[PDB]
Short mmCIF file of C-alpha atoms and ligand atoms in Angstrom, two decimals:
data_model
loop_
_atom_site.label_atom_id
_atom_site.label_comp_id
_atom_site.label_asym_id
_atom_site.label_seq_id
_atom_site.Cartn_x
_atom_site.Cartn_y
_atom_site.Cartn_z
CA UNK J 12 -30.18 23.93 8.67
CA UNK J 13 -31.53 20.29 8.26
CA UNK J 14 -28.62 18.73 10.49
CA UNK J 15 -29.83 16.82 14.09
CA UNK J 16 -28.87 17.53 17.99
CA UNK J 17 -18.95 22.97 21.70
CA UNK J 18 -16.75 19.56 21.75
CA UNK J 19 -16.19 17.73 18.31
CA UNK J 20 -15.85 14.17 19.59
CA UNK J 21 -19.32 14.91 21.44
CA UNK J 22 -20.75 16.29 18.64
CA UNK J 23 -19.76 12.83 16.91
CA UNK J 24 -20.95 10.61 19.33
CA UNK J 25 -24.46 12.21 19.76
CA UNK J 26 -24.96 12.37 16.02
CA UNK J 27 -24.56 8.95 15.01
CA UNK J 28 -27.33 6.70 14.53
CA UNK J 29 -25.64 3.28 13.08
CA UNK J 30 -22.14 2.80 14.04
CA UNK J 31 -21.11 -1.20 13.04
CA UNK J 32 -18.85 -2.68 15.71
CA UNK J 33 -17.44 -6.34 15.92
CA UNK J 34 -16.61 -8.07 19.24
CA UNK J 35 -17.10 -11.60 20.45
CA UNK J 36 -16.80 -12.41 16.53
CA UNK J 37 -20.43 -10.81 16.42
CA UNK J 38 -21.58 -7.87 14.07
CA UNK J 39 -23.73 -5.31 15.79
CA UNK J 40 -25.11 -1.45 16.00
CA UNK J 41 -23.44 -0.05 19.19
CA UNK J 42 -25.67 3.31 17.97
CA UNK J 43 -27.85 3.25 20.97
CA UNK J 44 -30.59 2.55 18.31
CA UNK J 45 -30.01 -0.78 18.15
CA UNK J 46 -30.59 -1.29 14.77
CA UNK J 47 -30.90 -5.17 13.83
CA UNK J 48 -27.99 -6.72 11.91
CA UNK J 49 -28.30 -9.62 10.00
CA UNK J 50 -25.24 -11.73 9.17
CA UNK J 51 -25.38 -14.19 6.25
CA UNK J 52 -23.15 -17.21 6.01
CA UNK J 53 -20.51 -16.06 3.85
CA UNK J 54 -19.63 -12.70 5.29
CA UNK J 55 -16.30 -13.46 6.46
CA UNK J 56 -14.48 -11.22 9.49
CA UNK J 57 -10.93 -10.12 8.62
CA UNK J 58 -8.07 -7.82 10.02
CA UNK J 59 -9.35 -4.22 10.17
CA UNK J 60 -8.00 -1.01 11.13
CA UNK J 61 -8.77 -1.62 15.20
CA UNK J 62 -10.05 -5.02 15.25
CA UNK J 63 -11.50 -7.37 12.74
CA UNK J 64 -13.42 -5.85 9.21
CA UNK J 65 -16.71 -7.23 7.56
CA UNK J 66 -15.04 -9.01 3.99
CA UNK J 67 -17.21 -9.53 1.22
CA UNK J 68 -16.37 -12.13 -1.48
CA UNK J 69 -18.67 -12.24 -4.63
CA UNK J 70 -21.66 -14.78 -4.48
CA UNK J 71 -25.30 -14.46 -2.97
CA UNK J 72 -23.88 -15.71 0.85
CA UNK J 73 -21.93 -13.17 1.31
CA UNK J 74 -23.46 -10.01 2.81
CA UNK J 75 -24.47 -7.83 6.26
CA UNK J 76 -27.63 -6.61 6.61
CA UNK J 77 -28.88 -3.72 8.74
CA UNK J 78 -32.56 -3.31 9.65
CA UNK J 79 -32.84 0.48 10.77
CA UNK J 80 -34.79 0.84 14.24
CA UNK J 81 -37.94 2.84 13.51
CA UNK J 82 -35.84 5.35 15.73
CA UNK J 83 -33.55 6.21 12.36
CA UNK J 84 -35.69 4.37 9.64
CA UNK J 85 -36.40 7.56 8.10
CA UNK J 86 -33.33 9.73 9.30
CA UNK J 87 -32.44 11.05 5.19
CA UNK J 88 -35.60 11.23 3.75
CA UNK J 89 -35.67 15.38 3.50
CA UNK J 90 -32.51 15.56 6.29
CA UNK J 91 -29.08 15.72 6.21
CA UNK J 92 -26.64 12.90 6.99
CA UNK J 93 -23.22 11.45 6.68
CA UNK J 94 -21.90 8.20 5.63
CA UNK J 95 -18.33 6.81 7.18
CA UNK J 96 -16.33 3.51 7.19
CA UNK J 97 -12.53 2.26 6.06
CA UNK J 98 -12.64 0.86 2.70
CA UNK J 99 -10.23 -1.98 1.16
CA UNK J 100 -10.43 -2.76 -2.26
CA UNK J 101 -7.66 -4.86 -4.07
CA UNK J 102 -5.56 -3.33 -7.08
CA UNK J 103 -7.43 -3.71 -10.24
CA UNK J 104 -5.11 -5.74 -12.80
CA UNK J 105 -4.71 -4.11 -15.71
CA UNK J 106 -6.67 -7.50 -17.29
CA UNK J 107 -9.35 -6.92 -15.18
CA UNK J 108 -9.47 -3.46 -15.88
CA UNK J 109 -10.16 -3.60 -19.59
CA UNK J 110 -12.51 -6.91 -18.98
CA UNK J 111 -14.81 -5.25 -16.27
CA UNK J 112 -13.70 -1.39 -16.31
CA UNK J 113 -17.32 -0.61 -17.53
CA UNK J 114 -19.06 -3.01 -14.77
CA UNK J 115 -20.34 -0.61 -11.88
CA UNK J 116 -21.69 -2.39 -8.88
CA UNK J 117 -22.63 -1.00 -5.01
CA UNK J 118 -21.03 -2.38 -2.21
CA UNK J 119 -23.30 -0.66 0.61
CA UNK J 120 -26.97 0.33 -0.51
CA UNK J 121 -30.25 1.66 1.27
CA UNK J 122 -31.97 1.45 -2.37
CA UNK J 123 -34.29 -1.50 -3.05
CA UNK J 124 -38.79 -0.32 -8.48
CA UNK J 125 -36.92 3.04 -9.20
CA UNK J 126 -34.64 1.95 -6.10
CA UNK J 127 -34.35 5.83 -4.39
CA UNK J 128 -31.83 5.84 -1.55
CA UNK J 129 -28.13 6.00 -1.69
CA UNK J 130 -25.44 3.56 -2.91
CA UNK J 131 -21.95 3.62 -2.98
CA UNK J 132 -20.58 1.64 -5.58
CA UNK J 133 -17.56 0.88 -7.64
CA UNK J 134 -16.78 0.46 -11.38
CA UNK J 135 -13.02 0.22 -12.45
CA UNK J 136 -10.97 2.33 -10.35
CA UNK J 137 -14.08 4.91 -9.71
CA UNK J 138 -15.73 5.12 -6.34
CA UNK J 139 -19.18 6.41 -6.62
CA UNK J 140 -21.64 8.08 -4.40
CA UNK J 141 -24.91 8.07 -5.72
CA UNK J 142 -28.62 9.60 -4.68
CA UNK J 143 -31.88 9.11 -5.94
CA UNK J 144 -35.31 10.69 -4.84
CA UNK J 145 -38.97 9.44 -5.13
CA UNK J 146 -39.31 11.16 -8.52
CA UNK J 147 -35.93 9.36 -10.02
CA UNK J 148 -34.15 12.31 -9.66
CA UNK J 149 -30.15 11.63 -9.36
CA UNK J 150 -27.40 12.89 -7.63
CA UNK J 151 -23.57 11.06 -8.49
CA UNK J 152 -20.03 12.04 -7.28
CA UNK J 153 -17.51 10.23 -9.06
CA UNK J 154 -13.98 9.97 -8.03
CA UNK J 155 -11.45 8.76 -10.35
CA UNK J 156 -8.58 6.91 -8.27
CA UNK J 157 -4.77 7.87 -8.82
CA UNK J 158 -3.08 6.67 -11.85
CA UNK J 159 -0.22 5.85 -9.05
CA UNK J 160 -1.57 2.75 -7.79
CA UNK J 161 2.07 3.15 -5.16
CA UNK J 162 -0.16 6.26 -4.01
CA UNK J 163 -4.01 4.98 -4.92
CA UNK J 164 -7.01 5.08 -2.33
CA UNK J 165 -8.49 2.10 -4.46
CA UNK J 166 -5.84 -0.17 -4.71
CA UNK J 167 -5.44 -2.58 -1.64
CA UNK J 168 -4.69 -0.28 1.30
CA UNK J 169 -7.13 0.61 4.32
CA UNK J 170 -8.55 3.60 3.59
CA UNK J 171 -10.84 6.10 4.90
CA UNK J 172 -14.38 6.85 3.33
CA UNK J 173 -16.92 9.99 4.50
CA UNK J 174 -19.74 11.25 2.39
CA UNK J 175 -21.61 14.47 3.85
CA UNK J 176 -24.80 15.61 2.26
CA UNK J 177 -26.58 18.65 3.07
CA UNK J 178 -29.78 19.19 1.52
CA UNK J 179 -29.74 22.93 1.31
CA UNK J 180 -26.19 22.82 -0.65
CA UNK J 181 -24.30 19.62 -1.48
CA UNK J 182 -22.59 15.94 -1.18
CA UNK J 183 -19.07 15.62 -0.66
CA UNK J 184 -16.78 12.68 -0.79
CA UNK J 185 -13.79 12.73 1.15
CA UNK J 186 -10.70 10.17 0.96
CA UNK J 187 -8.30 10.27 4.27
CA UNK J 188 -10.04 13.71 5.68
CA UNK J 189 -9.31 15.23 2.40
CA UNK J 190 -12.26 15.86 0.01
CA UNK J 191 -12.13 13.90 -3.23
CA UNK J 192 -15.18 14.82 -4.62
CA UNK J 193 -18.42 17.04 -4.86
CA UNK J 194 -22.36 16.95 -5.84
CA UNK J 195 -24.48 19.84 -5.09
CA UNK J 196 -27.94 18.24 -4.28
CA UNK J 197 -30.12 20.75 -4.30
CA UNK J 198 -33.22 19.89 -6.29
CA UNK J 199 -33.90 16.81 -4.54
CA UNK J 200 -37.36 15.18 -3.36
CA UNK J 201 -37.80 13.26 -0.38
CA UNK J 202 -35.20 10.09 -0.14
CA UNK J 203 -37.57 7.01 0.38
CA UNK J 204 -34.95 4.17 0.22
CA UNK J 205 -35.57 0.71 2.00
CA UNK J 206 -36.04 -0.46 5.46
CA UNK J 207 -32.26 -2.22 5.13
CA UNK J 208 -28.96 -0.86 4.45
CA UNK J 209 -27.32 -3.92 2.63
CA UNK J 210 -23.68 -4.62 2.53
CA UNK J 211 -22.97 -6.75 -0.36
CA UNK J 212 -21.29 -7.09 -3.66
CA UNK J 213 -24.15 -6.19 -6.20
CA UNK J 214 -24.30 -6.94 -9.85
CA UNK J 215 -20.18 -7.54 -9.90
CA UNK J 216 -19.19 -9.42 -12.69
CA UNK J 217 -16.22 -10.56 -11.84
CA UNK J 218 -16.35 -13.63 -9.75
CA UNK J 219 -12.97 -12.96 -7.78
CA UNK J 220 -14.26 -9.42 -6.94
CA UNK J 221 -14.13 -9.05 -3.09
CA UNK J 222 -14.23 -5.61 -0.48
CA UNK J 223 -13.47 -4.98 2.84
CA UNK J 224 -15.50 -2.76 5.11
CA UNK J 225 -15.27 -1.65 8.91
CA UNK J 226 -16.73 0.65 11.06
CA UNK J 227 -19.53 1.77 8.95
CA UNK J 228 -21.26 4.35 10.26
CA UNK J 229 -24.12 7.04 10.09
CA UNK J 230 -24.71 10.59 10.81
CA UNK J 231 -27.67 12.78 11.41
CA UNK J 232 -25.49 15.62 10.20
CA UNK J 233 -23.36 16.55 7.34
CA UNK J 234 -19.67 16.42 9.20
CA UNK J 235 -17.62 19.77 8.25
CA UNK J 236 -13.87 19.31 7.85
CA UNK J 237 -12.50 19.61 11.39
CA UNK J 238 -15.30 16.95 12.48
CA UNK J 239 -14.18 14.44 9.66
CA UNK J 240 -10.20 14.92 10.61
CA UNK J 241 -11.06 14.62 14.16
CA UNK J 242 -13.45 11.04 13.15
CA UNK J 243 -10.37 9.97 10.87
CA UNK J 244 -7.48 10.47 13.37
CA UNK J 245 -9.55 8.84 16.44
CA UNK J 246 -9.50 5.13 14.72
CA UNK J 247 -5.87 5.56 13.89
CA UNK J 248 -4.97 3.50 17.90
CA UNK J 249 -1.10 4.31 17.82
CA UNK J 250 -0.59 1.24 19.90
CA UNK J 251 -1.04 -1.53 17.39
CA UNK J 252 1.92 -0.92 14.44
CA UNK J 253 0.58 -1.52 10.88
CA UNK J 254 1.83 -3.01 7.66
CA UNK J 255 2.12 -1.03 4.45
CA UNK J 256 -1.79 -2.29 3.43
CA UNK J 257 -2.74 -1.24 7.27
CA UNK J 258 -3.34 -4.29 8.50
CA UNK J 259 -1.55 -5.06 11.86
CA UNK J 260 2.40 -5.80 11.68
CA UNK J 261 3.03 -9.04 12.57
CA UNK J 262 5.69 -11.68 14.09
CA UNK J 263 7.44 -14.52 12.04
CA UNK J 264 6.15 -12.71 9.14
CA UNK J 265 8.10 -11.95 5.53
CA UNK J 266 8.16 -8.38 4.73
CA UNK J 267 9.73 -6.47 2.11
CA UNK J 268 11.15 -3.21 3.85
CA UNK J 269 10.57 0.48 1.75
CA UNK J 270 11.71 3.83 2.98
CA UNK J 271 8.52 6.65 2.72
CA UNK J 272 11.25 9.11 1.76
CA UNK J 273 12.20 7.45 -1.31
CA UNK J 274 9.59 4.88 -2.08
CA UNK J 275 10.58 4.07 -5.53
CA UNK J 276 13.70 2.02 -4.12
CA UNK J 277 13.73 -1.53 -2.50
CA UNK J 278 16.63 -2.56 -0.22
CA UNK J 279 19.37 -4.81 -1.31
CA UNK J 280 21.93 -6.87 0.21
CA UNK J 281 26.04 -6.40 -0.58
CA UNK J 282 26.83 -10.04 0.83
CA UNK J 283 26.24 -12.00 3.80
CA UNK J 284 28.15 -10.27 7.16
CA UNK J 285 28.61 -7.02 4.61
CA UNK J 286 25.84 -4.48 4.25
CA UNK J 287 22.60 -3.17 2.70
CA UNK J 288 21.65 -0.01 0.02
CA UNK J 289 18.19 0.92 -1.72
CA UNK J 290 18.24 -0.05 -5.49
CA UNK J 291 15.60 1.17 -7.65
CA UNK J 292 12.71 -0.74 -8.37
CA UNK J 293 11.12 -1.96 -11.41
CA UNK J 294 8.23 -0.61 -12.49
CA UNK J 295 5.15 -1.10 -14.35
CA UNK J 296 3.47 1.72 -16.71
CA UNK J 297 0.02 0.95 -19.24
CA UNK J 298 -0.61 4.11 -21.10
CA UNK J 299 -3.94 2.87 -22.45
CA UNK J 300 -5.24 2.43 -19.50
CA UNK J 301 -3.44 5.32 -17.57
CA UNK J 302 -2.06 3.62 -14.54
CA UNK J 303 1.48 2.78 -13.82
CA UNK J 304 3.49 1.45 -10.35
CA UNK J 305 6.78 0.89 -8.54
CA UNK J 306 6.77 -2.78 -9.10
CA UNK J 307 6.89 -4.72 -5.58
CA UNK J 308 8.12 -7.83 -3.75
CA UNK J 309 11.43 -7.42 -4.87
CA UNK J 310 14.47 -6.72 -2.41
CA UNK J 311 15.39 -8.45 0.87
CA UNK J 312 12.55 -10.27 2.93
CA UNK J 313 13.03 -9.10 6.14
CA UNK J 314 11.47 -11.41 9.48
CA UNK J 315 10.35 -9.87 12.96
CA UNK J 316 11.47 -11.74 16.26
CA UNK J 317 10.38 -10.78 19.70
CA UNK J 318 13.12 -10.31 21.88
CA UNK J 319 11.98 -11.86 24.70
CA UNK J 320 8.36 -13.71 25.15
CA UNK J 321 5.70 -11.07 25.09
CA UNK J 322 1.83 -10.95 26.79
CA UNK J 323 0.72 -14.36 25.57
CA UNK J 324 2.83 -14.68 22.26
CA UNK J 325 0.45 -12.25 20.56
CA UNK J 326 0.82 -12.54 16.82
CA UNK J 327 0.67 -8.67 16.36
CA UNK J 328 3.51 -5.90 16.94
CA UNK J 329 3.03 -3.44 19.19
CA UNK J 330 4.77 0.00 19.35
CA UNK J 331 7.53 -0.22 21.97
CA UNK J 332 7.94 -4.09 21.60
CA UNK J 333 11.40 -5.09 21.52
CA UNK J 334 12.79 -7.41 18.58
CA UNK J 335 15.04 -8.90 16.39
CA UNK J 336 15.14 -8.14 12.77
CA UNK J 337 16.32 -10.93 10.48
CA UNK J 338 16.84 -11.18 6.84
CA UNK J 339 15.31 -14.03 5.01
CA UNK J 340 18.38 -14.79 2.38
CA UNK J 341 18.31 -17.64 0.28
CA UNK J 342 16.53 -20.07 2.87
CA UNK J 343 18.68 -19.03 5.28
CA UNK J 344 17.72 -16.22 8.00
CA UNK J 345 20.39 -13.95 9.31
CA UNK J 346 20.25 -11.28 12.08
CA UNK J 347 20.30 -7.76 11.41
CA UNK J 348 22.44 -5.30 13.83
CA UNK J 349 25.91 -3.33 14.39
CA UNK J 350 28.96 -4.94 15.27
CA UNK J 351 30.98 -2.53 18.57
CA UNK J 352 33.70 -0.46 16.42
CA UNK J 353 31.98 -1.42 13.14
CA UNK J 354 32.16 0.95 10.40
CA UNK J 355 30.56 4.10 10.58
CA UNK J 356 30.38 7.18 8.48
CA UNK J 357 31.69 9.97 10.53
CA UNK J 358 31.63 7.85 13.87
CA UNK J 359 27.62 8.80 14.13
CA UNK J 360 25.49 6.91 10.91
CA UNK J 361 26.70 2.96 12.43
CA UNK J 362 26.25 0.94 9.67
CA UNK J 363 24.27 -1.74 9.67
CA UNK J 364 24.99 -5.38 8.77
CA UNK J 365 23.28 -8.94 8.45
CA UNK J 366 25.14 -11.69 9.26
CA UNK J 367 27.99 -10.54 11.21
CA UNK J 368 30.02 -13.24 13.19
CA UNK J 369 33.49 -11.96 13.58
CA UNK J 370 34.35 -14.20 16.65
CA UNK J 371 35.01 -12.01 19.87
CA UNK J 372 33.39 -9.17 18.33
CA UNK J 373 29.76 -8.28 20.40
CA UNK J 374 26.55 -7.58 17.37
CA UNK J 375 24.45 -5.54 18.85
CA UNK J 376 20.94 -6.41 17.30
CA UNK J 377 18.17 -5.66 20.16
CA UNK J 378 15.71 -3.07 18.55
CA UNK J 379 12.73 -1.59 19.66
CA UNK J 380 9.78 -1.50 16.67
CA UNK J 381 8.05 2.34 17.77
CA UNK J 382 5.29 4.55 15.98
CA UNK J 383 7.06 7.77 16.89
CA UNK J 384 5.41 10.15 14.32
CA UNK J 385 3.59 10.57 10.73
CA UNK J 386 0.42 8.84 12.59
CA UNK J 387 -1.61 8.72 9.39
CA UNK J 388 0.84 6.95 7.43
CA UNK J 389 1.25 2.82 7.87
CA UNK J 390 5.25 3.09 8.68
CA UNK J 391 7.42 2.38 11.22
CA UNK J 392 10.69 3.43 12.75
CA UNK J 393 13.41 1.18 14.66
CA UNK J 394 15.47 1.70 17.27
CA UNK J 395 18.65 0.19 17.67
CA UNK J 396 20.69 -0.70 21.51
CA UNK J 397 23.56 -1.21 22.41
CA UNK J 398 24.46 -4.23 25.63
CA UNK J 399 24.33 -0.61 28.02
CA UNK J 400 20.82 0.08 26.97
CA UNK J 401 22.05 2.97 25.12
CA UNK J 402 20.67 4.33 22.01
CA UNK J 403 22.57 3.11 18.67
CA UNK J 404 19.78 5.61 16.74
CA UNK J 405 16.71 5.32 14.20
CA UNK J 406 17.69 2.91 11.09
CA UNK J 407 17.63 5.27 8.10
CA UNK J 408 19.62 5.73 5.53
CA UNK J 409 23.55 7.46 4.75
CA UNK J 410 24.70 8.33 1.27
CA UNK J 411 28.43 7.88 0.77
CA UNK J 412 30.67 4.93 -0.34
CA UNK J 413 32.47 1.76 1.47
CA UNK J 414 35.87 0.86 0.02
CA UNK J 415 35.80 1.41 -3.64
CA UNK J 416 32.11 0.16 -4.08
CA UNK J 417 29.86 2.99 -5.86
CA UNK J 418 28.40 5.68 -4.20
CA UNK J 419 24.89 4.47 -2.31
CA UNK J 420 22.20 5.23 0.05
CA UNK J 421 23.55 2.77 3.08
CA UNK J 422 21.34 1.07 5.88
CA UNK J 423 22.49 2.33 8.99
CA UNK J 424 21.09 3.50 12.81
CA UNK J 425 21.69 6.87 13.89
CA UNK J 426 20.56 9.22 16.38
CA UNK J 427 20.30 12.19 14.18
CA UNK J 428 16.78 11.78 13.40
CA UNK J 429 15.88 12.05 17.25
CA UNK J 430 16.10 16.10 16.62
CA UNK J 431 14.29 15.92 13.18
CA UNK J 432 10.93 14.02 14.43
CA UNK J 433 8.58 16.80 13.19
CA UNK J 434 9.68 17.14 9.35
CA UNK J 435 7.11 15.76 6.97
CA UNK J 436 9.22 13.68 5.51
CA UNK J 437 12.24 11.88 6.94
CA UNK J 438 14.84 8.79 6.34
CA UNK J 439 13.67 6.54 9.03
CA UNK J 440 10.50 5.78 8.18
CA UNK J 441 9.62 2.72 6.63
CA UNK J 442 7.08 0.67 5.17
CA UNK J 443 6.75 -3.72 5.72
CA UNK J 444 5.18 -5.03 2.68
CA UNK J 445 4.02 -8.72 2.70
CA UNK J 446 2.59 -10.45 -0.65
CA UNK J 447 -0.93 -9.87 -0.73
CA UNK J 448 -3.91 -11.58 -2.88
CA UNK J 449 -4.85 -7.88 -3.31
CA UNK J 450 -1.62 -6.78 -5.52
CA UNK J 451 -0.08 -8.56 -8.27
CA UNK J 452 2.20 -6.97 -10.49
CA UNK J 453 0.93 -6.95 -13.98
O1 LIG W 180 19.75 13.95 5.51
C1 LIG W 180 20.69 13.56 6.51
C2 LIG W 180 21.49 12.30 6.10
O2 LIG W 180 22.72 12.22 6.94
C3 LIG W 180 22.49 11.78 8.33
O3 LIG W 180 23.74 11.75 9.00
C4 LIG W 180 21.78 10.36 8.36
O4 LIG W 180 22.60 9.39 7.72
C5 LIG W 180 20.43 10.43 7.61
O5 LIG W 180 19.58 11.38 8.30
C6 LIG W 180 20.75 10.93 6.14
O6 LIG W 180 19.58 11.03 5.35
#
């Protein structure tokens, strides 16, 4: 066994030997090692999964360097090790795609000529893992993203990166805890790579081209499975709720609202005071280049309010947080919520409406925004009250019919879902979408 150094979170923690943290607006290695970091002018700090992200735009300013302690300087040269950070990489247009498909170019590097090290680069919609030894030699674990770019690690959501190598066996690339990809790297000579681990967009061609990376870390060991979950899970901080890219939710804020149980339908509006029911959405589909999506952006905008003032009018939701939901409707916002003795199906699934102002009639519309389960996935659930305090339910989803209007899957709150919290998938999860530079519909 070639690995360094019972508990798996101290296992972790005594085998890193670069872990990247940001506070105070200032990039550092909280290792132990203290391994120099260098931070050029144009390496901006953005939104990350617990904090702010490193963000790398394409031009010579923009990059992070790490100068390894002598401590760790030569940590992989014949011994294992593990690489780990969350990854954000915009969706590829299908433009770009055919005009720079064939451009590779690393992102992190420790190769410097012959260059041996490691790299982890990018070309198209392949991530790539790549080794080198003294003699040339080459290692490479390519991973071909998901034609689904709804359901693709590459295309503009936080995701999460680990690459074990063992040099008695092999290099695996794993996506979200679950492994993506495999090298055996047996074979190999002694990996002299350079004295700095560079974080920068190398030999992109395409000027727009930009990446975001956070907690990037290092291993004296090649993580098994349980140690990888275990890594994964501990950044997910179930306080902080999360858009549908996993950046944090956010007040005042335009979202468009999709239910994880049928994501391939955007919410619509009946009319104003009336209610809402999921439509399918339009899609997009390029058999040439073998990638197709549920369009987005299309259905109602939907705004957060907080209910009453919270800490210090912190821009960011967190889970428990009361609110008011409002739909954004033709330049006019209008509050979502239940009218008392509106229309129900069965007395239980209360319909919900936007707009309401029957005169005399109480709305109820205070709602709580919660993180009450799927903890890997960036959704949300929402609790509706009553003016007791009393639980209204979860909003979800009812099929049936109003009137003589067709048959639909209704927006309504129920309690139902309270007994139904452990199925893998269920109606009352949902995903905020806001426009992002990092996914335009083709
Ligand atoms: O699957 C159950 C179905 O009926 C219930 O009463 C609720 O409306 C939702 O949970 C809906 O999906």
């Amino acid at each position: 066994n070639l690995d360094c150094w019972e508990d798996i979170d101290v296992i972790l923690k005594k085998s890193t030997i670069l872990n990247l943290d940001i506070n105070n607006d200032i990039i550092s290695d909280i290792s132990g090692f203290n391994s120099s970091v260098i931070t050029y002018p144009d390496a901006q700090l953005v939104p990350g999964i617990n904090g702010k992200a490193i963000h790398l735009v394409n031009n010579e300013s923009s990059e992070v360097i790490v100068h390894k302690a002598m401590d760790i300087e030569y940590n992989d040269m014949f011994n294992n090790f593990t690489v780990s950070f969350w990854l954000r990489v915009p969706k590829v247009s299908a433009s770009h795609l055919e005009q720079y498909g064939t451009n590779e170019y690393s992102i992190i590097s420790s190769m410097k000529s012959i260059g041996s090290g490691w790299s982890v680069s990018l070309k198209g919609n392949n991530l790539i893992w790549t080794l080198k030894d003294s003699a040339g030699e080459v290692r490479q674990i390519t991973f071909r993203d998901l034609p689904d770019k709804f359901n693709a690690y590459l295309a503009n959501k936080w995701v999460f990166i680990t690459i074990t190598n063992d040099r008695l066996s092999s290099a695996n690339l794993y996506i979200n805890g679950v492994l993506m990809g495999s090298a055996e790297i047996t074979g190999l000579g002694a990996i002299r790579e350079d004295n700095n681990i560079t974080l920068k967009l190398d030999r992109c061609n395409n000027n727009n081209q930009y990446v975001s990376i956070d907690k990037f870390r290092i291993f004296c060991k090649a993580l098994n499975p349980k140690e990888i979950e275990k890594l994964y899970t501990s950044y997910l901080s179930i306080t902080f709720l999360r858009d549908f890219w996993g950046n944090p939710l956010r007040y005042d804020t335009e979202y468009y609202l999709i239910p994880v149980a049928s994501s391939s339908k955007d919410v619509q509006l009946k009319n104003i005071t009336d209610y809402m029911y999921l439509t399918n959405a339009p899609s997009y589909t390029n058999g040439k280049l073998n990638i197709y999506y549920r369009r987005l952006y299309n259905g109602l905008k939907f705004i957060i309010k907080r209910y009453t003032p919270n800490n210090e009018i912190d821009s960011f939701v967190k889970s428990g947080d009361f609110i008011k939901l409002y739909v954004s409707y033709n330049n006019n916002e209008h509050i979502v919520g239940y009218p008392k003795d509106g229309n129900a199906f069965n007395n239980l699934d209360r319909i919900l409406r936007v707009g309401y102002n029957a005169p005399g009639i109480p709305l109820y519309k205070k709602m709580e925004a919660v993180k009450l389960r799927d903890l890997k996935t960036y959704s949300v659930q929402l609790k509706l009250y009553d003016d007791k305090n009393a639980s209204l339910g979860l909003v979800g989803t009812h099929n049936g019919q109003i009137g003589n209007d067709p048959n639909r899957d209704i927006l309504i709150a129920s309690n139902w879902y309270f007994n139904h919290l452990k199925d893998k998938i269920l109606g009352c999860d949902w995903y905020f979408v806001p426009t992002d530079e990092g996914w335009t519909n083709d």
